[PDB]
Structure formats: C-alpha cells, structure tokens
C-alpha cells in the first residue's frame, strides 16, 4: 500500500527535503541509498515509500516540479539530495512571477504533460496504489497554479484513489507578498472541488510553537519544515508498522468527514517540550492528551474555543493500555461537552501503533475538524474584497487572459464554504 508524493514550488520542495530526511532516518537509509538499519521491522514495509534500485540502493517515489531551477538545484545539492532519481526533476526556464494566471494558464499547460507522464509511469508500476500526497503553498505563484492544475488532472485520472494535500496559507500578521489574497482565493476554490482531504498550516502558529513551547532563541525555516515533516510522517505510520488497532487513510476519511465539503482539518503533535524542561516531566497518556487538546499545540491561528468539534482523530504510537486511551477520550468529551456537536454520540476515533518515532517513548498526532477554520478564510476574503473593489493589481492577471468573472465565482464559492461551516456551528437538534 504505497503512496506517491508530489512536491511543488519553493515551500513544497523545502518541506519535502526535510520529510525525506525524516523518513530515511526512520527506516535507516543512508544518504548514499544503502540500507544501514538495525531492525527487520524497518525493511518489511520499505516498499510503501521507496522503490528498489539494483544492488543495495533504494529510491524515493517522488516527483519534483518547479518553474525556475534554483530551488531544485539547491535540493539536489543538499546532503540527502542524491537519493532522488534524476529523471524525476522537471523544471522550466522562467519564473511564475508570483502570478496565479501565469502559473495556471501559460507555462503550466506547457510543462504539465511531462509531469503527468512521470506520475503515470510511477503509478502504473505499483502493485496496488494508495492515495497521492502533495505539498505546496496557496499564497505563491507556481505552487498555487500548477498544484491545483495537477490535482485536477490526477483527480480525473484516479477518481477511486485518495487525494491528500498539505498546504501552507498566508497569514495577515507577517506577509511576504502583496498579492496573496487573489492566489489564495482561486486556490481554495480549486481545492474544495478537487480534494478529498486538505490539511492547513499557518506560519504564525509555527513561530508561536517555536518561541513559546520550544523556547528556541533563533528558529529557522528548517525548524518549521521539520515540525510539518513530523506530522506528515506521523499520519501515515499505521500504513507501515504493526499495531493493536490498525488504521488507514480511507478509514480516517470515513470517520472524519460527515458531508463531502467539510474536509478541512487542523494538525498538532504532542510531545513538544524544551530540553531544559524534559528532565521535569515524564510522558503519559493523560499528559499527551492535555497537550493534544491545548490550542497552544495547534498549527493554525484559529482557536478551538470559538467553535465546536464535529469529529477528531488521534493516532497513538507506543506501548500503552487501551483502557486508559478510551477513558481519557471519554473524560475529555464529557467534561467539555459544550464544545462537541451533540447529534453525534462519539466524536473521537483512537488508534494505537506499537512502534514510536526514534528517541521518543510515545507520540500522538491529532487531526481535528472544527468550524473555527471559517475565521481564517473570512480574513482572506476581507483582504480580497478590499483589493478587488479598486482593481488594485488586476491588469497583470487580465493580461495573462483571465476574465473578471472567475474572481466573482471564486469569492462566491469561498463565501459559501464559510456559510456552510457557520450554519452547523449555530444550530439546534430540533
């Protein structure tokens, strides 16, 4: 049960490099590609993410795409970069220009066929294909346009598989680019139709994790991408190791999404704690559960206390009793009962896996479906409405060729997504 990864744009390629470092470490793969691990449990599911080349070496089932090769040359030049298959790097000759329309319509359609050819070559070689995994930012140019284009093409070609996305989205507190609202609105419009499950992360939340929880004096983008790579590698853990209560991406989707538009989730990872403090507090399921529901440990700016949970899932790694897990999830549901949607009798799914991440006795990753995500989209829509009334930078997009009607359509679809989330928050059983 093997996943194919696609990494698009600068943010996606950078997070991907750290992800493949973390995965190669957990399975004991040397940066030369030689297996150097120390338990049979590592080898027995290696097929899930790696293909085997002749001899010792293993090669990772990933496609790298970018519009200017600077980032790709940096990732190929990195310390683990050699493991990647040379034929899997696809690049153009001129940048996205931070413009969605350029990335989607002009150079996108020029490159996109070679990416589908590589993805099809990789998929049809698999004996049974599980979902795709894609990392990209929504605020950028090449990330937004080709990521959503490629997602649409893969959804046309593999409608029976799973579609999973990890996405970084612009915050108003610390923007790097002026035209972020347009690109974000068009990308959310594409995702809500095409995707099966989409995960969202705010850079502001990663900075607050680093400064308040980890007390790092000088965090860097490598740290933010390491936290994201930790959650990404954690969600898939039950695919590739034994456990007392197995779980699967499809089982996650069936238990989390009540209605097909409501597929946007929050992320957290629990055993975050500073090196000075670690001597003072042992790991246990109550402690993990307390950190797990603390809004301090969530990777989005919206806070759970302003909404209600429709559904949530917790995947535990480590040797632990099921009784303590079940009663902790029951006690949290009973004590905070106003924050859980009342017409569902049990909102939390649990899963238990025997093999923890290296150097931790136990870990849990938390996925939550909460209506407070509407505030984030609303904030982006406000900035769009401020910019759109004055045609502030629109001639670039119109010069690529877009009709203004796309912008009003994308706004209407995002506004309808916000309305759909808001109605279930404010409702009675009747």
């Amino acid at each position: 049960r093997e996943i194919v990864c696609v990494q698009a744009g600068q943010c996606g390629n950078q997070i991907g490099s750290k992800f493949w470092e973390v995965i190669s470490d957990e399975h004991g793969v040397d940066p030369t590609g030689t297996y150097q691990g120390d338990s049979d449990l590592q080898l027995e599911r290696i097929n899930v993410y790696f293909d085997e080349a002749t001899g010792g070496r293993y090669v990772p089932r990933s496609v790298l795409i970018d519009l200017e090769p600077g980032t790709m040359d940096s990732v190929r030049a990195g310390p683990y970069g050699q493991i990647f298959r040379p034929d899997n790097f696809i690049f153009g000759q001129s940048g996205a220009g931070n413009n969605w329309a350029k990335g989607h319509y002009t150079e996108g359609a020029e490159l996109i066929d070679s990416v589908l050819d590589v993805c099809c070559k990789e998929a049809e070689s698999c004996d049974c294909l599980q979902g795709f995994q894609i990392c990209h930012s929504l605020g950028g140019g090449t990330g937004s346009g080709m990521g959503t284009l490629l997602i649409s093409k893969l959804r046309e070609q593999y409608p029976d598989r799973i579609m999973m996305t990890f996405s970084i989205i612009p915050s108003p507190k610390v923007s790097d680019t002026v035209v972020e609202p347009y690109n974000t609105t068009l990308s959310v419009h594409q995702l809500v139709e095409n995707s099966d499950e989409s995960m969202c992360i705010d850079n502001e939340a990663l900075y607050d994790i680093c400064f308040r929880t980890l007390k790092l004096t000088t965090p860097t983008f490598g740290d933010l991408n390491h936290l994201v790579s930790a959650v990404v590698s954690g969600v898939t853990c039950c695919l590739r190791f034994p456990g007392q209560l197995n779980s699967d991406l499809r089982k996650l989707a069936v238990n989390l999404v009540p209605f097909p538009r409501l597929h946007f989730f929050m992320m957290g990872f629990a055993p975050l704690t500073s090196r000075g403090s670690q001597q003072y507090r042992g790991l246990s399921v109550p402690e993990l559960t307390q950190q797990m529901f603390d809004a301090k440990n969530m990777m989005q700016a919206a806070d759970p206390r302003h909404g209600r949970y429709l559904t949530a899932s917790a995947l535990f790694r480590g040797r632990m009793s099921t009784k303590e897990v079940d009663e902790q999830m029951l006690n949290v549901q009973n004590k905070n009962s106003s924050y859980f949607i009342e017409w569902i009798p049990n909102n939390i799914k649990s899963s238990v896996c025997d093999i923890p991440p290296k150097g931790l006795k136990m870990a849990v990753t938390f996925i939550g479906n909460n209506t407070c995500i509407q505030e984030m989209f609303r904030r982006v829509g406000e900035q769009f409405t401020l910019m759109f009334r004055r045609k502030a930078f629109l001639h670039w997009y119109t010069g690529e060729g877009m009709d203004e009607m796309e912008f009003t359509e994308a706004e209407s679809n995002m506004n309808d997504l916000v309305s759909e989330y808001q109605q279930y928050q404010d409702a009675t059983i009747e």
């Binding site: 600077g70 940048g95 220009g97 931070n98 002026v178 972020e180 000088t218 670039w396």
Partner: protein
C-alpha cells in the same frame, strides 16, 4: 539571469564607471578582464553571468554599451585604467554634442547614430539564453540624454517588445540648477518616458549632497561620491539575481508587486547604513535600527517629503546576515507607526527579499564595513510635488517663448511643448485621483 546595461550621455557614463568598478570588485575580475592566475580551481561558477560573458580563453567582458555624442568621456574610458575590460566596438562616440537641445539629439544627430546602437544591442541579445530586462542610466536635463534616450527607448520597445525596461534617471534638482533650459528638456523627456518604461527610479543631486553632509562627514562632496552611492544601490537591487538567499526576487516580481496601474510606475529609492568608519565603532547596527532608518526622510536620495502623501507599495531588500523573523518584527513595528500611512486599498503593503552576500568595500570609498544593509524602493503619491515645480518653471519660461527659437529652428513644432505639458498635467491628475478614498458609506 542576464541583464543588459545601456549608458547614455555624461551622467550615465560616469555613473557606469562606478557601477562596473563595483561589479568587478564584487565578483573579483581584475581590471584587465582576467582572474588571478593562482585562484583558479578547475570548475568556475555562474554568478558573473548576470553581468559578464567569458571568452574561450577565459577573459571576462561585460554586457554593456557606452553611448555618447561627444567623444571626450568615451575617450576617457578608452584611455583610462579600464581600457582592456570593454570591447572597443561597444564604446560608440559621435562627433558633436546635442548642445542642450532635445530636438538636436532626437531629430538631427541621434538619427544617424541610433542604428549602430540597435546593431550592438542585437549582437548582444543574440548571445543570450535568458535575457530578463534592460537597465538604463541617463540624465534628463541635457540634450543628448533626453533626446537620444527617448529615441532609443522607443526603438527598443518596438523591436524587443515585452522585455522589461528599468530606468535610473537624474532629475533636475528643485533649487540647485546647472543650465537654463533644464525644464524644457525634462518635460519633453518625461513625455516619452511615460509611455516606454516599466519602472522609473528618481534621483536628486541635492538630496545626495545633503545625505553625504549629514551622515558622512564630507564638507566638499563631488560627483564620484554620488556615483558610488548609485552604484551601490544598483548592486543591491541586482544582488537578488546573483547570489543564494532565503527569499529571492526576480525582476518581474518588482514590477508585479510595485506597479498597481500601468501609469503609476515612478518610485523612490533609499539606502540605510550610509555611515563613516569613526561613527561605526560607536553604534551597533541591528536590523530594527536600519529598518527604522530607511523610513526617515534624512535617508532619501530624492528631495521629496513622504509625509505629504500615502504609500502604495514598499519593496524592502535585505542583504547580508539577516534572519526573516527580524524582518517580520521590524515591518510590524513600522506598520505600528502613526506617521507612516498606507492607502486603504493596499493592506499587504510590503514585499521582502533576503540575500546572504554582504555589501562590498571599495578601496577609495567612504562607507564603513558593515555586516548587513537594507535598500528600499517604494511607490508614493508624494512624487506629484516633484512634477508640479518643474511645470511651474516651464510655465514661467513658456509665457514669453524664452528660448523656443532654438527648438523650432532645430526642427520641432511649437505645438509639441503644449502636448507634453498637457500629458504631465494628466499625470499629476492621475496621482491626485489614485490617492482618494471612496465608498466610505456602506
């Protein structure tokens, strides 16, 4: 990757000498175009490629042309220290100057020389594989810089099309002046520059003199100091193309982020750690102090006060040892300030860039050595005040036809003055209209 530099007239060639001196010293090419015979490693690196191409013997030669109608300045380049760096065909010189007449440069004299310039630029553009714009240096106060610069920009814009054209322009200072006919030439230049340029950077000599008096300790500055500051600014802006960094910025990203409407393309430029060596040991120079510095009007290189207008967009380029979190904290502190105001239709007002290469130190230079620097280009409605004073001086002179007989004799209809003056009036009205607030009622 590649950019082509076009230097026109006296100010543009003299600023070019400082620019190419700096770019040589930053990459390490010796003045004869070679590299040290010892430092060679076997496999060289692409960073020069933005500005230099190498011959098969390994000599470097730069992607520039020097254009003048009088010989003297180009003969100074041919006989100077950098004789061997430039290709001799690239250094084009006429017989006689345009004598402060835009008409003489544009109609009579530049028409003979212009086809050589296009042939040289074509020969350069054929030896490229990723050209991404033209950089142009000229002054609009003189005859050949205005007239031939306009004619050449028109021809370049028809032949090359969509490629971007970024101009660095020295405008006539608001009370320091050097020639009587400056208003006429600047108006007629600006008429052509409106249609055929993608971004225009504004300079005033009086501001760079003031900056060199207050921050540096120079009582008697001269043009070499100003030209070294301009060269440093250009090196800072093009560094994003040439070295590794956290947040790169391609030249098309400047135009996408800075220009909201196709006429609103005139921008202000400033540079932060202009400081002397003796001051440098009394002060630390963290990110937040230089970020606060770039917004003070004492730092600006154009004589305008931005407190009389509203910012529309800012582009902040950081080079050296800077970390993104400090940029974010600084920009949030700037955003907090009450004397800094943005138009309400531009909520996300800033674009950032971060590059690892620290600023270079020039052997004869007057700047201190510093670990980090920031450079800003920003779009603001305050620029409307600069045009209004030139227009007032034009109106004063044109009421009596003070010099017009030269221009009509050298080939121009009197009507062309009124057309240009009406176009600049419309540009002033555009800057009045763009700055308004509407639909307050909801």
């Amino acid at each position: 990757r590649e950019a082509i530099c076009i230097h026109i007239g006296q100010a543009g060639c003299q600023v070019g000498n400082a620019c190419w001196e700096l770019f040589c010293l930053e990459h390490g090419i010796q003045p004869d175009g070679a590299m040290p015979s010892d430092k060679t490693i076997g496999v060289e690196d692409d960073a020069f490629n933005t500005f230099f191409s190498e011959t098969g013997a390994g000599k470097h030669v730069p992607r520039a042309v020097f254009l003048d109608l009088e010989p003297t300045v180009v003969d100074e380049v041919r006989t100077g220290t950098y004789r061997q760096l430039f290709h001799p065909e690239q250094l084009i010189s006429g017989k006689e100057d345009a004598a402060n007449n835009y008409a003489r440069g544009h109609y009579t004299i530049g028409k003979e020389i212009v086809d050589l310039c296009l042939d040289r630029i074509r020969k350069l553009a054929d030896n490229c594989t990723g050209l991404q714009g033209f950089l142009v240096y000229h002054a609009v106060g003189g005859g050949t810089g205005s007239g031939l610069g306009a004619l050449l920009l028109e021809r370049l814009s028809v032949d090359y099309g969509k490629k971007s054209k970024l101009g660095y322009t020295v405008y006539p200072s608001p009370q320091v002046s050097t020639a009587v006919v400056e208003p006429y030439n600047s108006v007629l230049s600006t008429h052509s520059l409106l249609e055929h340029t993608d971004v225009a950077a504004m300079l005033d000599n009086e501001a760079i003199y003031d900056l060199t008096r207050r921050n540096l300790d120079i009582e008697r500055p001269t043009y070499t100091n100003l030209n070294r500051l301009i060269g440093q600014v250009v090196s800072s802006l093009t560094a994003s193309l040439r070295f590794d960094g956290a947040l790169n910025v391609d030249l098309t990203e400047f135009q996408t982020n800075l220009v909201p409407y196709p006429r609103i393309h005139f921008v202000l430029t400033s540079y932060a750690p202009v400081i002397s060596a003796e001051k440098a040991y009394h002060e630390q120079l963290s990110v937040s102090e230089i970020s606060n510095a770039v917004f003070e009007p004492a730092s600006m290189m154009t004589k305008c006060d931005p407190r009389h207008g509203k910012y529309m967009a800012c582009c902040l380029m950081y080079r050296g040892d800077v970390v993104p979190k400090d940029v974010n904290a600084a920009v949030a502190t700037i955003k907090t300030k009450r004397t800094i105001q943005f138009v309400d239709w531009s909520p996300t007002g800033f674009k950032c860039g971060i590059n690892y290469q620290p600023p270079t130190v020039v052997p004869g230079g007057d700047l201190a050595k510093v670990q980090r620097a920031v450079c800003m280009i920003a779009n603001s409605t305050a620029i409307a005040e600069v045009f209004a004073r030139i227009d007032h001086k034009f109106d004063l002179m044109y009421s009596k036809r003070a010099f017009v007989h030269w221009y009509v004799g050298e080939g121009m209809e009197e009507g062309e003055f009124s057309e240009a003056r009406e176009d600049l009036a419309a540009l002033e009205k555009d800057y009045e209209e763009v700055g308004a607030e509407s639909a307050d009622m909801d």
